[PDB]
Amino acid sequence: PRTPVLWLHGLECTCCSESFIRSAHPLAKDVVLSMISLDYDDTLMAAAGHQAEAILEEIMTKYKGNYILAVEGNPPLNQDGMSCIIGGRPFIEQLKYVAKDAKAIISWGSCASWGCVQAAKPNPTQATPVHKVITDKPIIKVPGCPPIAEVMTGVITYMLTFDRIPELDRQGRPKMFYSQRIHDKCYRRPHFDAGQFVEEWDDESARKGFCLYKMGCKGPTTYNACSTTRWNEGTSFPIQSGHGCIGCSEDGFWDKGSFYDRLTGISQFG
Amino acid sequence: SAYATQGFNLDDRGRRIVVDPVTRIEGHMRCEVNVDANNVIRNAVSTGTMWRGLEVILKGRDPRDAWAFVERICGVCTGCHALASVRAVENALDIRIPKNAHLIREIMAKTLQVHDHAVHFYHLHALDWVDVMSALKADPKRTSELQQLVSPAHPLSSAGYFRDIQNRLKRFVESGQLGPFMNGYWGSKAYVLPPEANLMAVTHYLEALDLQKEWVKIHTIFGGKNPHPNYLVGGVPCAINLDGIGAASAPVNMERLSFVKARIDEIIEFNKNVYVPDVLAIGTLYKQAGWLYGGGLAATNVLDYGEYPNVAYNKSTDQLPGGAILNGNWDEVFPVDPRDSQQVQEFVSHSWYKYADESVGLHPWDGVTEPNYVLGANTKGTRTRIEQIDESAKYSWIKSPRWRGHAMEVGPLSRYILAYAHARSGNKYAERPKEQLEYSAQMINSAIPKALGLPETQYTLKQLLPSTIGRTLARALESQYCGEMMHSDWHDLVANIRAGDTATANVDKWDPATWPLQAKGVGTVAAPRGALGHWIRIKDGRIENYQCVVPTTWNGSPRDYKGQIGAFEASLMNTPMVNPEQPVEILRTLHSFDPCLACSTH
Ligand code: NFU
Ligand code: SF4
Ligand code: F3S
Ligand SMILES: [Mg+2]
Predict the structure, then answer these.
(1) Known binder of ligand: residue B482?
(2) A15 lines ligand 3 (CB under 6 A)
(3) From A81, which residue of chain B is nearest by alpha-carbon distance?
(4) Set of chain B residues whose Cβ sits within 8 Å of the Cβ of A123
(5) Which of A17, A14, A9 shows the shortest CA–CA distance to A91?
(6) Which CATH number does A1-177 carry?
(7) Eight-class DSSP state of B303
(8) d(CA A125, CA A83)
(9) Is B596 labelled as part of a ligand binding site?
(10) H helices of B151-273, where?
(11) Dihedral over Cα of B179, B183, B187, B192: its sign
(12) If contacts are CB pairs under 8 Å, which of residues 136-175 in chain A contact chain B?
């Protein structure tokens, strides 16, 4: 009996669903066919409208306290909640309903974890992270915009294997993926340590792969697996391809000034 | 209430049907229709059911940062907004990017096209044409034989292979946990494929799911990650170094470029051997069943900005040449100018926003985004529990874009109709799309029917293209064309680098101290779903206004001040439903637009 997953979508750009299906180990195909039962998911599901809604009740009844609720995106509180409408009602109402009988809740990505782009100032919809509306259920934050594919499927794999949520840090993120800052293991670190920096795009330093700190890299304050696990089966990550980390796994990263403004007090990151 | 517009006779006196949520799209949509005594759709209402307010959030921020914000408009068409943004800012600040940056952006754009199109067809659209339960009844041997007729060059064709796939599907279904297939409309008479065709398609569904993750590694190389690769105002961040000292030292070296070429070659094989043949075969069989519905506005009014100039910054050389066609006159393509205040305008008469004067449409440089969620007095239900939306008032988070007041369809089909019209007018740059269309017509009319022992037909492109089948075909053809194009782009990039031009960024105007104190710019992109534009105003180094008009904004638009309907609503009109309580035909046609609702509303 494969564990049912009800995958809800709030205000979102769907980057988290898209990342999920990039997973190479394990393949998304194998997750859906062999590991979970993906019973409700707007992106992929055959049923629509009334037939789709009916699935929620059926699973919540048969598998009470034994399904995982995955949330992509987040609920808005402004516009009476109707800046995200599902089945003619506010998304927040669907979220609260399905959450109540979940065994565990996964907050996919920075949207569900922190608010992400729609929650950036002045947050016209009052988009709100899941843990600020659902306060009485086991939640795990898997932040990033989106998270790395293998991090997403890694979390699912752990939860299925062990029937437990993995060890979390104080911010509710899995330590197995979010214990390191990008800057800890970044391959450009030897340049940082030697004060070798890119100062303008495509300068000689950039062509030599010098550190991107002075171009605004937020690696030194950002927890994620990008510098080691890397992206799309270990092909690259933002810094390897020449752009500074913009801090996309961290709470409120859209409102920490320009992405191209360097962190102050460089000495504190040495 | 009933009225006529654009040759459609709207009537809301029939039975009301609601589809909410519409699934297998990106984002959130509600669709309502009315059907007559014979189950024919006589009214259709498109409601975008989400809004985030990116245009509001951008105000006051640094134009150099904008691309990263607007990229998060959509993770499916990931990067298309970033491209529009950097183009808009570069337009405003008079920045010319280096050739390598142009080519790398083009390669990234065309990679997105292929990934988006192929994933759409198989993983979002196919279940509207393909009955998975029927696939379980197929004979593996006859499936193998069908595969060899549909695509002789595809190597995965053995009876044993299809048998193995079928067996896993059966175990899956027999487990009692049907997952994404739960509560499906399987068995409906709306499904016309033979079992063998269904098994072939489901097989390719699984193949595509495994393969799509490889294609995007092109994004990862140039842009660090996918979804949401990085861009840069003034060029690209992926600096180039081929010397020995550039051995994994620089973002881009020859090894990285070789890797990219290998991915491109695989894409070209998939499009040619799997995607295009599948769509031709499925199209042919639904054509034979007489399902040529869903033309909507495609039969009259189509628009695209034009894209992919073989010579940078020279629009006459667009390889997907754009413009506007009206009234189904393919003999006259009007030029489209995104700078012209009288051309692209957005109304909000029936949208949840407010203007100073809502009797007029605003050009995006003068655009305004102020939310106004309010329901008409004839709504059934309440503000937070809608039973039946009131389309006489404001009924969507999507604005209503029009061109010189006309409602237009946008997307691959529009681009292919435009390319065909250009080609006939003597435009050589459109030769390849024309060739694709003529090839496809012959396959659908004659070649595939003969192969399958079916009657030959004699539909012209004029008759065949404006349809849900045509819309689906055009998307596949565009994927193929894009793969072919970026193959050439790769060669041009490598040639330029080896000639000694390694520049990837123009930083002359990177610092805001160099900017004009006021500026306006526009960037346009041929996004996977159609015509995308970003319009920016800059003042004292900050964003004064930022307005997006996005392909699904056009297609999914609600009615305008004149009461004209948009592409979604037009496409559903005049379509019979087998069972009003199963939205199979509604989904099939809506999905043929590849609706991106997060895009549409931003
Ligand atoms: N509509 C839309 Fe997107 Ni998610 C844009 N621009 C694209 O193809
Ligand atoms: S500042 Fe950024 S590029 Fe430099 S070593 Fe740290 S993480 Fe790497
Ligand atoms: S931008 Fe995000 S993808 Fe990793 S390198 Fe920084 S946390
Ligand atoms: Mg807009």
Answers:
(1) no
(2) no
(3) B384
(4) 57
(5) A9
(6) 3.40.50.700
(7) E
(8) 7
(9) yes
(10) 159-174, 195-215, 217-223, 254-270
(11) negative
(12) 145-146, 149
| Signed CA dihedral, B278, B279, B285, B288: sign only | negative
Looking up tokens 């939205």 gives B583
Which of B179, B180, B507 has the CB atom closest to A202's CB atom? B507
Q: Count of residues for chain B?
A: 602
- 8 A C-beta contact, residue B346 and residue B364: yes
What is the bridge-based pairing of β-strands B307-309 and B318-320?
antiparallel
Residue pointed to by tokens 């037939």: A51
CA angle at residue A167 from A165 to A168, to 5 degrees? 100
Q: Please tell me what resolution, in angstroms, this structure has.
A: 1.5
A263 by DSSP, 3-state: which? coil
Note whether B182 contacts A242, CB cutoff 8 Å: no
Ligand 1 nearest-atom number relative to CA B530: 8
Structure determination method: X-ray
Radius of gyration of chain A (CA): 20
CATH number of this structure's domain A178-270: 4.10.480.10
Domain count, chain B: 1
* Closest-lying ligand 1 atom to the alpha carbon of residue B525: 6
Spell out which residues of chain A touch residue B22, defining contact as CB-CB under 8 Å. 48-49
Residues 6+ apart with CB under 8 A from B509: B93, B94, B95, B234, B515
CA distances to A111, A112, B87, B186, B237 from A13, rounded to whole Å, are 9, 12, 21, 30, 24
Residue nearest to atom 5 of ligand 3 (CA): A245
Which chain A residue is nearest to residue B232, measuring alpha carbons? A243
For position B413, which CATH number holds?
Answer: 1.10.645.10
| Residue B115 in tokens | 């990934």
Residue nearest to atom 2 of ligand 3 (CA): A248
